[PDB]
């Protein structure tokens, strides 16, 4: 079942891949891995191939590596990145040292899309819907993305979208406030906060909270949604943060409609519901999907949830070689998704 491999050197790093991947082209250099674009002869599609960098260098890396392979292996949704293939040149566990991931290439990310055209309200609806449709799935599996922003959104010719690059346990502009200063532990509703920041930017054409530092940005967010009320304060477990918050000039939530005059009132209505300060009162992906704003795309019977995701591994305490063997096990056990 094992294919023929071939090696080459690009960007001073050796890649050993099955022959099915051709015309490899260095897309970028990253600290965690380096990614080549290639042509997958099997699927007839351009794909992305990630060679993970020093994946078993420390306990931390091994566990990081394991976590990503598990998470990627679990994702099976049209609006989320799928694992096309994962492989190692290694023929046994002892010689196992390198890991490559293959994922689909949609050619463009949301930043680049906005860069060369203006989006109709129709485009925005469809994009957000799909973000929300994927988040429903992700969240039902008890996963948090942890990083949503335009550059982790991949879009094609037909305006189809996939979510990519999950935070593995610029960016600040789309972060929820409760996690920007790490006020409390992360709810999956920080992702909803991100969607709100994205939607606004698509709608108006500008970054909503383009802060320069955490303090600058927090102040920017609080001018819109007001300062945290007494009920919210209690949830913050750090007294330092609390004392800090109480030092702030008290502020009322502003009226969104005045801030987004000329946008679809429904869109504004939905933004209102996503950009709620208290995370416990933010609309959910499931809830948001049913909003009138998406009347023309919403189908309850076609917005599926995920299987349960076992994350108990996270509280395991293993040797480097044990995380490594777990990972080899996942590489070995992968089942390629059915051909289209």
């Amino acid at each position: 079942e094992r294919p023929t491999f071939y090696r080459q050197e690009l960007n001073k790093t050796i890649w050993e891949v099955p022959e099915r991947y051709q015309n490899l082209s260095p897309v970028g250099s990253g600290a965690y891995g380096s990614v080549c674009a290639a042509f997958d002869t099997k699927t007839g599609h351009r794909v992305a191939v990630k060679k993970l960098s020093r994946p078993f260098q420390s306990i931390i890396h091994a566990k990081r590596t394991y976590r990503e392979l598990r998470l990627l292996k679990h994702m099976k949704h049209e609006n989320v990145i799928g694992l096309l293939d994962v492989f190692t040149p290694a023929r046994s566990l002892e010689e196992f040292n390198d890991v490559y991931l293959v994922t689909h290439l949609m050619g463009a990310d949301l930043n680049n899309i906005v860069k060369c055209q203006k989006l109709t309200d129709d485009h925005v609806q469809f994009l957000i819907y799909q973000i929300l449709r994927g988040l429903k799935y992700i969240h039902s599996a008890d996963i948090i993305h942890r990083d949503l922003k335009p550059s982790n959104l991949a879009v094609n010719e037909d305006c189809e979208l996939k979510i990519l690059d999950f935070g593995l346990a610029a960016t600040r502009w789309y972060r929820a406030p409760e996690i920007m200063l790490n006020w409390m532990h992360y709810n999956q509703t920080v992702d909803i906060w991100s969607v709100g920041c994205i939607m606004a930017e698509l709608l108006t054409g500008r970054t909503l909270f383009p802060g320069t530092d955490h303090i600058d940005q927090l102040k920017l967010i609080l001018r819109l949604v007001g300062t945290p009320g007494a009920e919210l304060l209690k949830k913050i477990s750090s007294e330092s943060a609390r004392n800090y918050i109480q030092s702030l000039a008290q502020m009322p939530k502003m009226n969104f409609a005045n801030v987004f005059i000329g946008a679809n009132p429904l869109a504004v209505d939905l933004l209102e519901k996503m950009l709620v300060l208290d995370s416990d009162k933010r609309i959910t992906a499931a809830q948001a999907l049913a909003h009138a704003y998406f009347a023309q795309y919403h189908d309850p019977d076609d917005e599926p949830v995920a299987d349960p995701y076992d994350q108990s591994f996270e509280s395991r305490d293993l040797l480097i070689d044990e995380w490594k063997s777990l990972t080899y096990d996942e590489v070995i056990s992968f089942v390629p998704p059915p051909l289209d």
Binding site: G107, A108, C116, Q117, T120, N156, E157, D158, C159
Partner: peptide, 8 residues
């Protein structure tokens, strides 16, 4: 059938 232009 809404569509987008890809960046070149």
């Amino acid at each position: 059938t809404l569509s987008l232009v890809m960046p070149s």
